[PDB]
Amino acid sequence: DPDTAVTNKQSFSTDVIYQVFTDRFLDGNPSNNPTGAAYDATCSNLKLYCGGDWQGLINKINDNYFSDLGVTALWISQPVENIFATINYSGVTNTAYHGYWARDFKKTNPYFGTMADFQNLITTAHAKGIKIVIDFAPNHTSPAMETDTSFAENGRLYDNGTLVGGYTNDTNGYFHHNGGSDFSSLENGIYKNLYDLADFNHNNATIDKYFKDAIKLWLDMGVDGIRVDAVKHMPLGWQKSWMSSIYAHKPVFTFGAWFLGSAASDADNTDFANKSGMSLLDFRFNSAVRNVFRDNTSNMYALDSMINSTATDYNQVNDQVTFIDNHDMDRFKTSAVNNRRLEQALAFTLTSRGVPAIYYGTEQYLTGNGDPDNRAKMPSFSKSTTAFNVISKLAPLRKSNPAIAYGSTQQRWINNDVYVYERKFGKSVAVVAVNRNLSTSASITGLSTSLPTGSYTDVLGGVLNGNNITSTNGSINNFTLAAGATAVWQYTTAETTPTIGHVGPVMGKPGNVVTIDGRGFGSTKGTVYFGTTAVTGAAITSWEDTQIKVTIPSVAAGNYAVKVAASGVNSNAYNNFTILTGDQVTVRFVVNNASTTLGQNLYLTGNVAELGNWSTGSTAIGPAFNQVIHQYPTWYYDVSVPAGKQLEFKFFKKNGSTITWESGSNHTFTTPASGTATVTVNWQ
Ligand SMILES: OC[C@H]1O[C@@H]2O[C@H]3[C@H](O)[C@@H](O)[C@@H](O[C@H]4[C@H](O)[C@@H](O)[C@@H](O[C@H]5[C@H](O)[C@@H](O)[C@@H](O[C@H]6[C@H](O)[C@@H](O)[C@@H](O[C@H]7[C@H](O)[C@@H](O)[C@@H](O[C@H]8[C@H](O)[C@@H](O)[C@@H](O[C@H]1[C@H](O)[C@H]2O)O[C@@H]8CO)O[C@@H]7CO)O[C@@H]6CO)O[C@@H]5CO)O[C@@H]4CO)O[C@@H]3CO
Ligand SMILES: [Ca+2]
Ligand SMILES: [Ca+2]
């Protein structure tokens, strides 16, 4: 199967995701519409239901709205059953139209459709070569008040009809009862309620099993990717464990939402993206893009800086999901923001690194500030807008040109208003030039690219006032980049040598199957390398010129680099591939009496790769928590660790560069075969 096909559940780099709020798109079947006060046929009261459902998505796939638009994947609202009650928030009536107020993760939301409608959606999508990604929120259920059970549905959870439990009288501790987060710290936001939403206590084995089971259900229905909600409000440890169970079953591209306010590096966010097993919605990319194109608060240098900075911080930048806007911010379009700028931001995104996502209605220049105003009904299906055009012309390049999907980025020319960058992968190159200035053109001189000698046409056919160029061994002849212009020139050729473009997923236990997408692998089954270990024959389940499916060998757990060797020729190395010890389980380490010095933090390390393998650096677990679940001088941390294994571990305090360990012997604990556990020790 080519890396490009719809069957590629492990990589979304050659795709273009279209994020759509199911209720606001198209009510294909009015027979499932809510009844009474929860419904608004006109769709003027954005807090109520408008009727949009799965049949609507099906319809638009069938009449090629999406196929002509160029999108190759749909990201939909959370498919599960949500609370039926209505909530009056200080005068205003609110409904679960957004899909975020889950009540039963094992059943579908009747308003969107049935199980059948859903399967029918998967089938129709795959038939047109469109992947399906689902929103999934395991952090909570619905809004609930501990004291008043008559508010909404008191956060009650169901296991395919069977009641598991509500927020009040939660004797079993299925939820956290530590008040509501004030967002003052990472820990405060993980173990307290996100507003009035009942927060799941994932340390509870029932809850742990429920979510692994529940996700298997949807994977088994053929979903191709998962968008995890509120990753910054759940423990990294649990999540990683959860992720390894997903990858051991049916690996699918998975990314989360860790909100950020600027393009500035955020340590925790970087750490999550590199250690959790999933990637993230790229908020740094978003900010920089808006500062430059929408708000005029930054110039091209800010944009280039972010490109570099992000590429440096994230292990696999090609896995971050990019966008110009979405449901958590103002629509890109304002009366004060002109069309050409929106169009430029699209073109920029479509050609830049990562996995691009377009919030529905962007092609129709939809406006709307704040929640719920930015989630208005799809206004029209005209295929005539300039923006609709750009998407259809640029999107396909993600599949046809590997420089775009897998390439690096090099700044070729820049100044306050002009930016010219180059995407390159093997012999395939792509050059994009943008002039955000709306009134004045720019004379470009001395531009060099890797474009071979020849004359190149603007891939956009001049619709954004682009021009053609002539290369003489990279040296492009002088030309003028018109006002508000943007052009794409590219060169594609067949790769002759093995060259890896993507590997998915990048975490697993021996025995799993990963996907290696690239070029020049040739059709002769060669050899795969995990560090020094050669993997050949039957262990390589599939081999093609552009994609290899291989099985993780039984080597020591750790960080590896992956190489493909085709016909004695070695390819480039894809770094930071994590090999786990085996199945995972989440364990909460607790240590008492660990008093510290001002600015001194407590960490944890032990005898397995998952605990750092006795390291005191970036591989050590921590810094531990000491406020919500357990107060200082007791510290705690939820860590993903190997199932049924005897572990040796010790805590250690670190301030500046001086390390102080626990004395005595190492602590030992044998982990359960599955589920979760708590182990409490005393600082030595
Ligand atoms: O059901 C909840 C909610 O779910 C969805 O939203 C999710 C969103 O997609 C995620 O990104 C994330 O939210 C992050 C957010 O995007 C970031 O901006 C940031 O949030 C900060 C705020 O920006 C900042 O303003 C402040 O927040 C304070 C508010 O300003 C203040 O008004 C008040 O909030 C109260 C609301 O006014 C009130 O109406 C009620 O809220 C309900 C909403 O009206 C209703 O639409 C719905 O919201 C959905 C939303 O539509 C989905 O997109 O339900 C809400 C209640 O269930 O109650 C509010 C609280 O009383 O107080 C807040 C806090 O002081 O600070 C925050 C700091 O974080 O980060 C967010 C978290 O990362 O998660 C949400 C939820 O999953
Ligand atoms: Ca409907
Ligand atoms: Ca939480």
The b-or-e profile of 539-549 (16+ CB within 10 A means b, else e) is ebeebebbbbe
SS in 3 state form for 485-517?
CEEEEEECCCCCCCEEEEEECCEECCCCEEEEE
User: Given the CA of residue 195, which atom of ligand 1 is nearest to it?
Assistant: 60
Considering only CA atoms, which residue is closest to atom 68 of ligand 1?
A: 183
Quote the ligand 2 centre to 147 CA distance (angstroms).
35
Rounded distance between C-alpha atoms, residue 196 and residue 173, angstroms: 17
Instruction: Tell me how far apart the alpha carbons of residues 61 and 86 are, in angstroms, rounded to a whole number.
Output: 32
- Say which amino acid occupies 443: S
Residue identifier of the C-alpha nearest atom 15 of ligand 1: 328
Pocket flag, ligand 1, residue 330 (CB < 6 Å)? no
Structure tokens at 424: 């390159």
Q: Which residues surround ligand 2, an ion (CB under 5 A)?
A: 27, 32-33, 51, 53
Fold for the domain defined by 581-684:
Immunoglobulin-like (2.60.40)
Q: Is 118 helix (H, G, I), strand (E, B) or coil?
A: helix
In the structure encoding, which two tokens stand for residue 12, read together?
A: 């979304």
Tokens of 187: 């820990």
In the chain, domain spans: 1-400, 401-494, 495-580, 581-684
The number of residues making up the chain comes to 684
- Quote the CA–CA distance of 50 and 44 in Å, as a whole number: 9
Name the experimental technique: X-ray
Q: Is the CB of 406 under 6 A from ligand 1?
A: no
Calpha distance 125→132 (Å, rounded): 7
Among the listed residues 302, 308, 386, 316, the one whose alpha carbon sits nearest the alpha carbon of residue 347:
386
Pairing of strands 469-472, 454-456: antiparallel
CA 213, 322, 128, 429 torsion-angle sign = negative
Beta pairing class for 646-654 and 659-661: antiparallel
Taking the CA of 191 as reference, the closest ligand is 3
> Which distant-in-sequence residues (6+ apart) come within 8 Å of 596 by Cβ?
602, 633, 653
Ligand nearest to the CA of 43: 2
Helix, strand, coil shares, percent, the chain, to 5: 20, 30, 50
Integer Cα distance of 626 and 636 in angstroms:
6
Binding site membership of 199 for ligand 1 (Cβ less than 6 Å): no
CA-89 nearest atom, ligand 1: 39
Contacts of 571 (CB under 8 A, 6+ apart): 497, 498, 499, 500, 518, 520, 563, 564, 565
Residue 593 burial (CB count, 10 A): 11
Query: In this structure, are residues 132 and 76 in contact, taking their beta carbons and an 8 Å threshold?
Result: yes
Query: Residue 92: CB within 6 Å of ligand 1?
Result: no
Residue 60 CA to ligand 2 centre (angstroms): 14
Give me the CATH topology for the region 401-494: Immunoglobulin-like (2.60.40)
Q: Residue with the nearest Cα to atom 9 of ligand 1? A: 328
Domains 401-494 and 495-580 share a fold: yes
**How many C-beta atoms lie closer than 10 Å to residue 496's C-beta?**
12
101 backbone dihedrals φ, ψ, rounded to 5°: -105, 75
The HSE-up count of residue 286 (CA atoms within 13 Å, CB side) is 28
Strands (E), 26-110: 73-76, 80-82, 87-89, 92-94, 102-108
139 alpha carbon, closest ligand: 3
Question: Resolution of the coordinates in A?
Answer: 2.4
Q: Which residues surround ligand 3, an ion (CB under 5 A)?
A: 139, 199, 233
Ligand in nearest proximity to the CA of 91: 1
CB of 188 within 6 A of ligand 1: the answer is no
Query: Does domain 495-580 fall into CATH 3.40.50.620?
Result: no
Q: Tell me how crowded residue 650 is: count the other CB atoms within 10 A of its CB.
A: 22
Under 8 Å between Cβ of 585 and 671? yes
Architecture of the domain defined by 1-400: Alpha-Beta Barrel (3.20)
- How many Å lie between the centroid of ligand 3 and the Cα of residue 228? 13
β-bridge partners, 214: none
